[PDB]
Structure 1
């Protein structure tokens, strides 16, 4: 049973999507920027 979206795996692979990478890569550098910048003065710069 369980007929929904788990029996038919997308694409002919299924192992690791780029999504995971981009987030581990980008957030990794984007996250650090916060902590570091938070130590010096991160109470006035939250405007993308």
Structure 2
């Protein structure tokens, strides 16, 4: 499993949640302010 432990830190996030990675992918896009639309 990859819900904690075994994560394999990829030099850019450890825990690496897959649902939180879509929320982190989400916010990754929305880390500008007005450059999404």
| TM-score range for the pair, normalised by the shorter chain length | 0.3 to 0.5
Structure of larger gyration radius: 1
More helix, by proportion:
1
Structure number with the bigger relative contact order (C-alpha 8 A, sep ≥ 6) is 2
TM-score by length of 2: 0.34
